[PDB]
Amino acid sequence: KASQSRSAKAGLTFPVGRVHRLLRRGNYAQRIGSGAPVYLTAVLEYLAAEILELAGNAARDNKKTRIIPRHLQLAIRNDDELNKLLGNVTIAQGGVLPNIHQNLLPKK
Amino acid sequence: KAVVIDDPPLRQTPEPFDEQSAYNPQSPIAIDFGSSKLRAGFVNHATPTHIFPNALTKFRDRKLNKNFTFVGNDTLLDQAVRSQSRSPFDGPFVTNWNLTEEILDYTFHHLGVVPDNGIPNPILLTERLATVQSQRTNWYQILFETYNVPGVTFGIDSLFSFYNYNPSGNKTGLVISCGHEDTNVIPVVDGAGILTDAKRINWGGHQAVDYLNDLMALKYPYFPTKMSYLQYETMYKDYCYVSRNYDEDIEKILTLENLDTNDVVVEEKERVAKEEEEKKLKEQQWRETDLNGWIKDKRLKLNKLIKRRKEKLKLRDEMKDRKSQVSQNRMKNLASLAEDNDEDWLIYTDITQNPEAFEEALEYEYKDIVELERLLLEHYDWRNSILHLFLRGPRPHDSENIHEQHQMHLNVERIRVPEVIFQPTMGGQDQAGICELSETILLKKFGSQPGKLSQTSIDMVNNVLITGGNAKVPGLKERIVKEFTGFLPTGTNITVNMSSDPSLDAWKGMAALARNEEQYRKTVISKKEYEEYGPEYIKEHKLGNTKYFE
Amino acid sequence: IYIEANTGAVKRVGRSDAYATEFDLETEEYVPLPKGEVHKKKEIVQDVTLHDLDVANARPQGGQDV
Amino acid sequence: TRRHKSARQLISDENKRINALLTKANKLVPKATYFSVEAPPSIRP
Amino acid sequence: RKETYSSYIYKVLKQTHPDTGISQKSMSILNSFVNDIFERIATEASKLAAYNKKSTISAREIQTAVRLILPGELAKHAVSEGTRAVTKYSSST
Amino acid sequence: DNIQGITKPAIRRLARRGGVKRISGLIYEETRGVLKVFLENVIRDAVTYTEHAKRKTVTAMDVVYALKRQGRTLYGFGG
């Protein structure tokens, strides 16, 4: 009779039921369908997985084993759809990508 | 040469009336209430008197008369009155019933019938195999109270055609009926159809025309005009055939030697200037002296410029991929430039993104290639591209002319559309095909083992009949014969029958039943049986339906 | 398959082409149906020498498989 | 007076009438109904 | 008692990078990020359901909200992942 | 040639609305390239609203909501 959660029924590692809870008493709608938390959970799965991929490659690119917010900042700002989505948010302790204008160089 | 299609031409002459002097109050009337057409006539004739599509429409006029009697063949008069026609059939069943009364009144008016207290003639009627009880009770109610006929008979049109082609009434054979909305395989033993083993496939001519419409709209999403149902119907009729072997015809249909035949087409400065003039004069002298060597050098330069431009285009295409190793190398270079010299400053300057400068460099390289081509003159094909072969056939295509911008090609669809009755999975129906249903009827049923056929199975194989309106597609009989030889044991004789026109065999069937034999009276239901047994009464005769339970 | 009536030899040619879509990737090889009849008969003439019979009857280790 | 009674729901109430008759008769095999005539899925791939 | 997503996203990182450590502040940024994304998607879906005079939230309005919010190739990969997840979950038969 | 629908004196009319004495000749095609991305950016969020409404016509009701979603809420046509 005992069966496990809906997250592995959908094959996901994020909690489906917690997302369903937050959608229920988040007063967005008076009635919430069954398939909505699964879809939202899968979208959050792919977004978090892609952000962790870019952060892991950034941390490999600096020869470290830990995720610094510099790695998150360079991974977000280097890539362009993450630039468009996250243009208006300032990452805490992120810094600024190096850029020099061509006319400001010592051209000679 | 592209052939243009249009709407079918309209009937100029109106449909005629039967004479009043030919009225016999005791003669019956045979009515085939098909989904696509209606066939009505008196019993004593051999050919049905009235053929028209089973549709009607309402007409509105400015004079406020509301004349709405455009029924059947009357709709084949104007384009506006034809497009608003509506059939009583929604799917395989009849949903609305006032239009059925109007259609029956129209055909009773055109049959030369003068009634009194209802119609005084018995009625021959067909019905769908294993129909629902509500259709039967409502048919009983309308035919016994609205029109008050003395006698009513029910049956299946495939069984009626089988009785037509063996009027002894006790033969044994196999009936395959390809109708408008469904396909049935009905086994017959001793003249009585064994309805416990008949099978039905939910596919017909209507689904085939809709499948052709969906396929052809998927093939050309930017078609300028919109084509009606009748245009898809007539190019389904004229350009479709059943292949002898689909699994070999698919692998060679798009080759060049096959597409040419069976593809149808349906519609300081002065010193620099003096140096440039001297270089031009030297080039002219070299062209006048050694034209072949200068032509070879210019062709080699054009080839080198084309190779460099191809490498630049390959690099530009590879730079767009985010998951490519060049993008990972660019990310590593950005991380190294962040990690950190004139060389480093030059690398940081040259590591900048320049898409517009890449387009300008491509334009300059194209100009240099054009200059090399002009120097060679002075001194990507569609054969191997299967998408162009599927789209525009074996001829080159240009998009600037309006004649072939309204042009359609039918190459794969000619065998793809009639193949769904053999593989219903292509149409989305999870059912077995015609050949597998015939195999499991003849081989794993009726006291027959695989490898040992009984006498009933041999008599069934020797008397296979194909009927229905959808038997007009060529190549059906040969394919059925080939598959039947495929699964049967060796030495078995297979005989198939097919009419010259298999649409009208059901009308000849009930004409021969009501005329030639007096055993038509065995199946006749009267007033008293309806009144004492109720509408849920079924006569278990040899040509109609049976009781739902055991 | 392939069955010889007189000698009882059995040879497997491969799986039929009608079962080629049970899996996308498979180890079995797929061959079409034979276009001829199932039963075939033929008359052949065998030429042997006495030395071949002497060799075949005098194998020192023993017989061999096909 | 008759309802419009589209072709989808006719299958539904005929099926529910068949199931009601079957559950009355149990607490009797069918012979030839609209659902017994329908072809089974294929066995070959 | 307080709520965080930390073990789940930790597992997501161990699926692709096993030998990688974590700053707690990085969890603070990424928790704020996933909450902010859930925030915009959920009120876009509620706004769209209030537009269509419907009282129910299903998979199709959040599908349209994902198409509205995300850029096009992320939108198509996100709806691909969501559709395969919801069809896997819907096969409870 | 249908992309040549917008005409150069109309761009001049828009320019003199801004109050500019001198217009160079490249500004017309620059504004063409600017406007072409711009209206497509609201056609992006209009027809998806239309499709989610199970409608095959657009109206004044979804286009104002597309502009209100992006951030230039416009008065006059309801909403």
Contact B530, B144 (CB under 8 A): yes
B152 burial via Cβ count (<10 Å: 0-12, 13-18, 19+): buried
Q: Do chains C and D touch (3 or more CB pairs under 8 A)?
A: yes
CA-nearest of B167, B144, B165, B168 to B154 is B144
d(CA B354, CA B366): 18
Structure-token pair, residue B386: 């299967």
Residue with tokens 């490498």, as numbered in its chain = B311
To 10 degrees, what angle do helices A36-60 and E24-51 make?
150
Pairing of strands B464-467, B408-410: unpaired
Rg (C-alpha) for chain C, rounded Å, is: 19
Distance (Å, whole) CA B446 – CA B442:
8
Whether the Cβ atoms of residue B417 and residue B426 lie closer than 8 Å to each other: no
B499: which residues sit within 8 A by CB, 6+ positions away?
A: B467, B471, B505
> How far from chain centre, in Å, is Cα D29?
13
Q: What are the Cα distances from residue B36, in Å, to B51, B205, B342, B503? A: 11, 10, 85, 11
Q: Which of F45, F48, F65 has the CB atom closest to E51's CB atom?
A: F65
Angle, vertex CA E44, rays to CA E41 and CA E48, nearest 5: 140
Experimental approach: cryo-EM
* Closest residue to D34, CB basis, from B130, B430, B431: B130
Residues 6+ apart with CB under 8 A from A69: A91, A92, A93, A94, E23, E25, E26, E29
Residue showing tokens 């009635």: A31
Coil, strand or helix at B155:
coil
Which residues have a Cβ under 8 Å from the Cβ of B281 and sit 6 or more positions away?
Answer: none
Instruction: Output the six-digit token pair for B397.
Output: 């295509």
Q: What is the largest CA-CA distance in chain D?
A: 50
Contacts of B490 in chain C (CB under 8 A): 37-39
3-state secondary structure B353-366: CCHHHHHHHHHHHH
CB B548 within 8 A of CB D32: yes
Do residues B228 and B217 touch, judged by C-beta distance below 8 A? no
> What are the backbone dihedrals phi and psi of residue B32, each rounded to the nearest 5 degrees, phi first?
-105, 105
- Count of Cβ atoms closer than 10 Å to residue B221 Cβ: 6
| Shortest Cα–Cα distance, B226 to chain C (Å) | 38
Q: Is chain F touching chain D, with at least 3 CB–CB pairs below 8 Å? A: no
DSSP string, B357-409: HHHHHHHHHHHHHHHHHHHHHH---SSS-HHHHHHHTTS---SS-SSGGG-EE
**Do residues B230 and B7 touch, judged by C-beta distance below 8 A?**
yes
Burial C20-31 (b: 16+ CB within 10 A, else e): beeeeeeeeeee
- A35–chain E Cβ distance below 8 A for any pair: yes
Topology adopted by domain E1-93: Histone, subunit A (1.10.20)
Q: Is B154 helix (H, G, I), strand (E, B) or coil?
A: coil
Spell out which residues of chain B touch residue A104, defining contact as CB-CB under 8 Å: none
DSSP bridge partners of B180? none
Q: Neighbouring chains of F at 3+ CB pairs within 8 Å? A: E
Single out the residue of B180, B71, B91, B135 nearest to residue B538, CA to CA. B135
B482 contacts B247 by C-beta, under 8 angstroms: no
Cβ <8 Å between B133 and D17: yes
CA B104 from centre of chain? 31
Residue A96 sits at the chain B interface (C-beta within 8 Å): no
Sign of the torsion formed by the C-alpha atoms of E47, E48, E51 and E55? negative
State which amino acid sits at residue B40: A
E chain contacts of residue A49, beta-carbon cutoff 8 Å: 12, 15-16
Cα–chain center distance at D2: 22
Domains in chain F, CATH or no CATH each: 1-79 (1.10.20.10)
Who's near B238: CB < 8 A, 6+ residues apart? none
Sequence spans of domains, chain A: 4-89
Q: Tokens 């096909």 — which residue?
A: C66
Measure D45 CA to nearest chain C CA, in Å.
6
Closest chain A C-alpha to B335 CA, distance in angstroms: 7
Round to whole Å and give the CA distance between F78 and F65: 10
User: Cβ–Cβ of A78/B349 closer than 8 Å?
Assistant: no
The C-alpha atoms of residue B334 and residue B318 are separated, in whole angstroms, by 18
Nominal resolution (angstroms): 3.1
For residues E69 and F48, give the distance between their C-alpha atoms in angstroms, rounded to a whole number: 12
What does DSSP say about strands B123-125 and B29-33: parallel, antiparallel, or unpaired?
parallel
- Helices (H), strands (E): how many in chain A? 5, 2
Is any Cβ of chain E less than 8 angstroms from the Cβ of F69? Answer: yes
The number of CA neighbours under 13 Å toward the Cβ of B22 is: 13
Chain A hits for B334, CB-CB cut-off 8 Å, are 74, 78
Domain A4-89 in this protein, CATH class: mainly alpha
SS3 D15: helix
Mention every residue, 6+ apart, whose C-beta is less than 8 A from residue B337: A98, B344, B347, B348, B351
Beta bridge partners of B39: B32, B51
Angle, CA of F63, F66 and F69, to the nearest 5°: 155
